[PDB]
Amino acid sequence: PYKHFMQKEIFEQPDSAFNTMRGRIDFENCVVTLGGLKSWLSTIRRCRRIIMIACGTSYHSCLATRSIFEELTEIPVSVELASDFLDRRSPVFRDDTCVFVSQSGETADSILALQYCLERGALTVGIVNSVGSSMSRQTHCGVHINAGPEIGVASTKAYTSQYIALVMFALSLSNDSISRKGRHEEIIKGLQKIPEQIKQVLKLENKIKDLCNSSLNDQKSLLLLGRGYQFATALEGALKIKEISYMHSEGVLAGELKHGILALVDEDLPIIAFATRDSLFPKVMSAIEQVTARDGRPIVICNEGDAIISNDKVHTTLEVPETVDCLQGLLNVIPLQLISYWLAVNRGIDVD
Amino acid sequence: GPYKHFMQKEIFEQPDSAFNTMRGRIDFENCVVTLGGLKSWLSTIRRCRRIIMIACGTSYHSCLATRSIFEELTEIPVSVELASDFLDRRSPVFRDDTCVFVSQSGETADSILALQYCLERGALTVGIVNSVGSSMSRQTHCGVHINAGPEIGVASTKAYTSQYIALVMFALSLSNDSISRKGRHEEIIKGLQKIPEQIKQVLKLENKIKDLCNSSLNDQKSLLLLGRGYQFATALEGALKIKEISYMHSEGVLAGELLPIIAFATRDSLFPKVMSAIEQVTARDGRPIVICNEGDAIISVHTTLEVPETVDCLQGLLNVIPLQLISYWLAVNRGIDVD
Amino acid sequence: PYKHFMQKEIFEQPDSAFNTMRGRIDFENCVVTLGGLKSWLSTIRRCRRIIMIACGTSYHSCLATRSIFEELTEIPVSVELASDFLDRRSPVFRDDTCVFVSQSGETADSILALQYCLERGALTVGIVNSVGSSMSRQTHCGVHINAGPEIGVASTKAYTSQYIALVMFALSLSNDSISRKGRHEEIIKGLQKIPEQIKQVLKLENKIKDLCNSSLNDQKSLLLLGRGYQFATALEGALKIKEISYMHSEGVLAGELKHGILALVDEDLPIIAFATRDSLFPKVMSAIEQVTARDGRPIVICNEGDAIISNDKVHTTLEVPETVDCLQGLLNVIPLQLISYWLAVNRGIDVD
Amino acid sequence: PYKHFMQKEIFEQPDSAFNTMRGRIDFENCVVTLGGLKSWLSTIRRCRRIIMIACGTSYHSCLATRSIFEELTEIPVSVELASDFLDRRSPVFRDDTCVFVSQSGETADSILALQYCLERGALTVGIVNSVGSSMSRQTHCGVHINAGPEIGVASTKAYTSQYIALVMFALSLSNDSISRKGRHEEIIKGLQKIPEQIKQVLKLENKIKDLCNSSLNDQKSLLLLGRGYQFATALEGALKIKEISYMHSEGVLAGELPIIAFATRDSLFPKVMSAIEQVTARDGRPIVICNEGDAIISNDKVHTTLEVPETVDCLQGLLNVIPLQLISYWLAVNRGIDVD
Ligand SMILES: CC(=O)N[C@H]1[C@@H](OP(=O)(O)OP(=O)(O)OC[C@H]2O[C@@H](n3ccc(=O)[nH]c3=O)[C@H](O)[C@@H]2O)O[C@H](CO)[C@@H](O)[C@@H]1O
Ligand SMILES: CC(=O)N[C@H]1[C@@H](OP(=O)(O)OP(=O)(O)OC[C@H]2O[C@@H](n3ccc(=O)[nH]c3=O)[C@H](O)[C@@H]2O)O[C@H](CO)[C@@H](O)[C@@H]1O
Ligand SMILES: CC(=O)N[C@H]1[C@@H](OP(=O)(O)OP(=O)(O)OC[C@H]2O[C@@H](n3ccc(=O)[nH]c3=O)[C@H](O)[C@@H]2O)O[C@H](CO)[C@@H](O)[C@@H]1O
Ligand SMILES: CC(=O)N[C@H]1[C@@H](OP(=O)(O)OP(=O)(O)OC[C@H]2O[C@@H](n3ccc(=O)[nH]c3=O)[C@H](O)[C@@H]2O)O[C@H](CO)[C@@H](O)[C@@H]1O
Ligand SMILES: O=P(O)(O)OC[C@H]1O[C@H](O)[C@H](O)[C@@H](O)[C@@H]1O
Ligand SMILES: O=P(O)(O)OC[C@H]1O[C@H](O)[C@H](O)[C@@H](O)[C@@H]1O
Ligand SMILES: O=P(O)(O)OC[C@H]1O[C@H](O)[C@H](O)[C@@H](O)[C@@H]1O
Ligand SMILES: O=P(O)(O)OC[C@H]1O[C@H](O)[C@H](O)[C@@H](O)[C@@H]1O
Ligand code: NA
Numbered sequence A, C: 001p002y003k004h005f006m007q008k009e010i011f012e013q014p015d016s017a018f019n020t021m022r023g024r025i026d027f028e029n030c031v032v033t034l035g036g037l038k039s040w041l042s043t044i045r046r047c048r049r050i051i052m053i054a055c056g057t058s059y060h061s062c063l064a065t066r067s068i069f070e071e072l073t074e075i076p077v078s079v080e081l082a083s084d085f086l087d088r089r090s091p092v093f094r095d096d097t098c099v100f101v102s103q104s105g106e107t108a109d110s111i112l113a114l115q116y117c118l119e120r121g122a123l124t125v126g127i128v129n130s131v132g133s134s135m136s137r138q139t140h141c142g143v144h145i146n147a148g149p150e151i152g153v154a155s156t157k158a159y160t161s162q163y164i165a166l167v168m169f170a171l172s173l174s175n176d177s178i179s180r181k182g183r184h185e186e187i188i189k190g191l192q193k194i195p196e197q198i199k200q201v202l203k204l205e206n207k208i209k210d211l212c213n214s215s216l217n218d219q220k221s222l223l224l225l226g227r228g229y230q231f232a233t234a235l236e237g238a239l240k241i242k243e244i245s246y247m248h249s250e251g252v253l254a255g256e257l258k259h260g261i262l263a264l265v266d267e268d269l270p271i272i273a274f275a276t277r278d279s280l281f282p283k284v285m286s287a288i289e290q291v292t293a294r295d296g297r298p299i300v301i302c303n304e305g306d307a308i309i310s311n312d313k314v315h316t317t318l319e320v321p322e323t324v325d326c327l328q329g330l331l332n333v334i335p336l337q338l339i340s341y342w343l344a345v346n347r348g349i350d351v352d
Numbered sequence B: 001g002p003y004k005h006f007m008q009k010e011i012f013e014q015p016d017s018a019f020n021t022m023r024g025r026i027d028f029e030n031c032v033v034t035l036g037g038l039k040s041w042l043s044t045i046r047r048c049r050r051i052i053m054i055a056c057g058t059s060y061h062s063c064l065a066t067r068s069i070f071e072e073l074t075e076i077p078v079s080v081e082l083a084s085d086f087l088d089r090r091s092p093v094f095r096d097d098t099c100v101f102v103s104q105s106g107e108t109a110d111s112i113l114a115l116q117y118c119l120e121r122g123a124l125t126v127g128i129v130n131s132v133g134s135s136m137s138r139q140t141h142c143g144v145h146i147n148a149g150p151e152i153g154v155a156s157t158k159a160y161t162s163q164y165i166a167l168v169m170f171a172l173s174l175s176n177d178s179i180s181r182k183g184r185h186e187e188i189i190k191g192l193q194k195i196p197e198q199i200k201q202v203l204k205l206e207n208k209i210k211d212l213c214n215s216s217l218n219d220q221k222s223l224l225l226l227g228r229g230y231q232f233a234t235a236l237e238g239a240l241k242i243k244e245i246s247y248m249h250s251e252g253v254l255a256g257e258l259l260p261i262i263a264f265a266t267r268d269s270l271f272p273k274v275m276s277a278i279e280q281v282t283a284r285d286g287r288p289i290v291i292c293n294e295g296d297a298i299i300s301v302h303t304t305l306e307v308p309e310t311v312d313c314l315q316g317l318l319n320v321i322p323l324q325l326i327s328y329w330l331a332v333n334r335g336i337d338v339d
Numbered sequence D: 001p002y003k004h005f006m007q008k009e010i011f012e013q014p015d016s017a018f019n020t021m022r023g024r025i026d027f028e029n030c031v032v033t034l035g036g037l038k039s040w041l042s043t044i045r046r047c048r049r050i051i052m053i054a055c056g057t058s059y060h061s062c063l064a065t066r067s068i069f070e071e072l073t074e075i076p077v078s079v080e081l082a083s084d085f086l087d088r089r090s091p092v093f094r095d096d097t098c099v100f101v102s103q104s105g106e107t108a109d110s111i112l113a114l115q116y117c118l119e120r121g122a123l124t125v126g127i128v129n130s131v132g133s134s135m136s137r138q139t140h141c142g143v144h145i146n147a148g149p150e151i152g153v154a155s156t157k158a159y160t161s162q163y164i165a166l167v168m169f170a171l172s173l174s175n176d177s178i179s180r181k182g183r184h185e186e187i188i189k190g191l192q193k194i195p196e197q198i199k200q201v202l203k204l205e206n207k208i209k210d211l212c213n214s215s216l217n218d219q220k221s222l223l224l225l226g227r228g229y230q231f232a233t234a235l236e237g238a239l240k241i242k243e244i245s246y247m248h249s250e251g252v253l254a255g256e257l258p259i260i261a262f263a264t265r266d267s268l269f270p271k272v273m274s275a276i277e278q279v280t281a282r283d284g285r286p287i288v289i290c291n292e293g294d295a296i297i298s299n300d301k302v303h304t305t306l307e308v309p310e311t312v313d314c315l316q317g318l319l320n321v322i323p324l325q326l327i328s329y330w331l332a333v334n335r336g337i338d339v340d
């Protein structure tokens, strides 16, 4: 039924999200069980620090979950792009837990980084889609994310499944804390609702197709504004627009600079702002106000029912269900996957 | 004086500010660094779980620019945080953290809020600050005043190079008990000695940069800066300067990870991916501007801005200077009053 | 009604034990709250290691509780005699939590050690009986054990009270652990019963006076055998007999040497063996057997109902109630306090 | 020309001390190189703490060297008796470096402790005499102490050889420190002289035989007083007197609350002086192990002196133990005990 494997894979996300969780979460009793990390959790916690290492969209899934790993575990977590980690020859030691995230399990820079960590005596953990791939075999332990084969040229379902697996890993690490139990239960109940909420978000495709057929087609760049949990989503949206749509895109930390890119943009530059409640900071509102003050006409991804910009000012809304704060990225990325897909179609590009 | 603007003056002041930052703190003959503010705190800093560097804007750049040398010389985990994002994530900190705050003014709101957060959590706090007795200077437990003198220009020029130098001295101080580091120490200190005179030499690129800025470069809507490794910070800081001073969009891009283009191709950061990126550009006849070491031919049409070769971890101090001059002259050519 | 303050203090222990716990343990909800440490616990929970530092009987209360601190917290715990700590110039750093235990809060070696740790930037915690004593003032935080004044020349109720305060501190450090919950509850329900069980143990006094009068008064030395939880009890009993009674005494790790002191003993040298269930190791049984075979007749401290040796093989029994393993030393020490006291008074030695 | 393997083994110590160092110390350039640990040191240096785990005399060699490890490395070091470590079910984790010291490499409690540590993911290092014994094989890395086979029933040369191997291990761990370079050179130059100093100490044998011919040999107990570096020597002396001489003995922390007191300069604390003064106040006739030429007790109190050469403070125990080995041996002979 689908024009392309990429469209199929985006639309497959209710099912891949469920498949990632299948057999791993008891939603009734709120227990996460990751069999691959079985005899290893008590060791993983006993480390100086967690280093998340990955490339491209897999690196963004690490950015998207860093905060919740930090929050739930109180272990320091850093996130490294594999090639830059290697370029810096960043010291790694026996007391580090190195977490490698990869859809393919074959990316050269990820494998080189893994070899570097292994030879230095670090504990290694893989979060990998392709079962038995190099990264899966070579990591000490890990989780196969169970998204199924990905044939689109860019990662869609693997991103949402990686993010979910990383959240389950964070929950697993913090499963002995009385003080975390309410937070755990909140997040696990939220996860249970993700697959159906993804289905809801997919109903935005018509509005997106329309927007992609608009003046948007002709524009040469698109800027995405995000802060907090949604900065990763802004970076991933930009990567998608670049890798798939062959259009220039940058993810911008919203409102960080008063006199940055937003003071420079043309009236008609496409700007997407993430304004869901989890990441609705004063600086986000300032950035959005700055755009509208200059007569810009931004596209706002926000929660159902929220009016971020007055009806008096021209702007586009793409409304998404509200979920638990640290899970909102799973829903907010979907319109970007669809926008990047339909822009590439509007332009004649093959995405498989 | 001879200077059109405060910003131009402060750019040209860098041989002196770089010297002043080192003054009384480095014995170049015996290769000994002595930072009076940190003296009795070093043993405590050396034993922490991790160092978190926390800063905004150009000061965040100076942390990125020196992250690798801290890691290399100390083998302590070092992370670099933008103050607002650190606060947005509510990143946990604890007694065993050493939090290093870098700020020219010592008054930036987000940096102060971040310091107060770390203090309340019981972390050890260290300031690298220009303004003596500012909030950040007072409220950190210990620190180094960078001694760059007052900064009047709207964007940081001398404060970036002086912060970077102060951070390198801090890294050297932390690792001054290591026999295996001694050769690397001496190399960096002998390098630092020559920085002020090398900065004088790089400032002689101004006329070449004026010629470049008189061209259609000054009419462009975007300028991309490509760098990797030590020079990625320099790419980010060049981008920030072009945005903040020249009012032109600019982006610092990690070279070859995935319109005028500036590429950093000095030897310290001349990776395969940089060469690949540069090849991609020349293949489409892109005409890149290449910042490279004196005498190197990185490309067989392009513009070359040659800079003296220094110790790898110090190359960013010389590479940033043409970007400061480009952002300044682009602004002048576009009729912007930089002050 | 007491002959000496020391006797009064020994008999005061049901009340001092209760007074130490008062306002600090919710026995129904199994919650421990130590006001003086409350705001400091997350900091202590985080350190590289705990160093317990003390002199004499206070040093023994640290040995008596070292295992339960290690078990409940999984933080390394070492136990230092203050003078030897200072003699070795053991390095201490900002990441150490140094726990100082002292009845008087004034002992020179403990104060010197505290000053050394403070100057090195370590976090310091006091467990002290004398409110506002030097050690109470100078530590960063602490617990006043609330045992009341001791006038006896040797510590009795302050030993049991210190030991209880130390167990409460360990419970407080581990009060966020789901996996520890059952063990927590076990110990707290145990602590609730300690004051009445001490009342029960104190009923051994007449049998102990008989034993001193029939078998011990004329003696020049006595050996205490103990292992595991009861090794500290054996050392403290030895100290009491030395300090109070002016008789030689040695605490011996039971069955450690096949040809050590037990291979050398007479059949009339008095030997006390701790054989309560919590510390009834094979090596303890072997030691006892090495004694009865040599025709030594050991004095066996054991749980009510237990027959450790044959009635065929001659021995004296002092039965004590069974409590939780890590609490059994609180009851096992009491017969030793009473023995040392009666030995002293039967020799016209003042104990106050 | 020896009566027993024990006596031979005591007298072999100049050679065993030399053999333990052979090929591992460059005394000219002051460099220690332990082949067995080469590429493991950077990892050993990166642990939360070091736990030294051993039984009997090997436990004492750990006590004897704890201070120098802590001094030189600034890593926390604890010393555990293997059986008690197991009795407590002491938690250990991936970030622990567990160091096992054993002459035989077969002692049951040390083996069980090793297996417990290995199961918990700890890094394990062996300091072992018997090449290819269980503990030699099962530790991740280690140093064979190269003392030669030990046939005496109690450890004599293995103690001084284990102690020297442990000091070399601490030197190796700290070989990157500029601030400790002077202390390193001092210890290494001191190690060079230990073999010939042990020869010197063995010349006390005749004085010791005279002492053991006295009514010392029909005593029921002998107390040994020591503090600091010499507390381990007092504990090891007491063990030797119990295991060999069949006489009760206790090693006592001097001044904490027949007498041999260690009063060498490395461990001449006020509390040691005060303890000795208590004995001479009662005209108790102590036996004093002290450095050559030091008068610890004046001649108006009766006492016996056993002078030993002064070495570097942390090495003094290597010499101070030798008279106790000889005392335990000659007491047994005078008591008709076959020490073998
Ligand atoms: C593919 C596979 O055999 N998975 C089985 C596993 O699923 P389960 O979900 O338990 O395990 P995973 O597929 O996640 O992991 C399989 C194994 O590979 C390791 N690993 C995985 C990813 C990685 O990047 N690195 C790595 O080392 C894990 O530690 C584990 O040993 O147990 C279930 C039985 O209950 C079965 O339904 C599955 O057939
Ligand atoms: C400010 C001051 O009087 N500096 C004097 C100091 O310079 P010196 O270079 O020794 O000290 P700095 O100016 O770097 O620092 C001064 C004090 O401020 C603290 N600190 C500094 C920066 C910071 O951000 N946070 C912070 O706490 C330092 O720990 C130190 O206690 O001795 C010199 C002579 O030896 C004098 O010429 C300088 O006038
Ligand atoms: C002295 C005081 O007013 N104590 C009150 C406190 O007891 P609470 O049991 O809370 O506190 P403690 O008496 O144990 O400690 C008093 C203070 O002294 C500090 N400290 C204590 C011991 C030590 O060795 N070092 C040290 O620094 C503590 O951190 C605390 O700040 O609240 C109780 C009600 O809950 C009152 O009944 C107590 O009268
Ligand atoms: C046993 C052996 O062949 N040793 C050789 C080794 O001595 P060298 O002194 O290098 O090594 P050791 O004999 O100390 O140790 C041999 C090996 O056993 C390991 N180990 C040792 C003891 C222990 O308790 N646990 C443990 O794992 C070491 O890590 C090493 O891998 O190189 C020398 C050549 O330069 C040879 O003269 C020695 O014959
Ligand atoms: O997740 P993987 O298989 O390690 O691949 C990482 C990245 O590899 C390349 O950079 C791809 O173009 C990206 O789309 C992909 O995300
Ligand atoms: O270094 P400081 O005083 O904390 O200021 C940080 C940043 O603050 C502001 O953004 C300035 O415009 C920047 O130029 C500056 O780099
Ligand atoms: O517990 P405190 O006050 O520090 O005293 C410690 C020790 O000090 C001295 O050693 C006393 O004789 C002991 O009985 C006492 O236990
Ligand atoms: O050093 P090993 O072979 O582990 O032996 C440890 C102890 O084992 C036994 O206790 C021996 O009797 C002691 O002499 C010895 O010291
Ligand atoms: Na694997």
Ligand code: NA
Binding pocket: B136, B137, B138, B139, B140, B141, B142, B143
């Ligand atoms: Na300050």
Ligand code: NA
Binding pocket: C135, C136, C137, C138, C139, C140, C141, C142
């Ligand atoms: Na206090």
Ligand code: NA
Binding pocket: D135, D136, D137, D138, D139, D140, D141, D142
């Ligand atoms: Na081995």
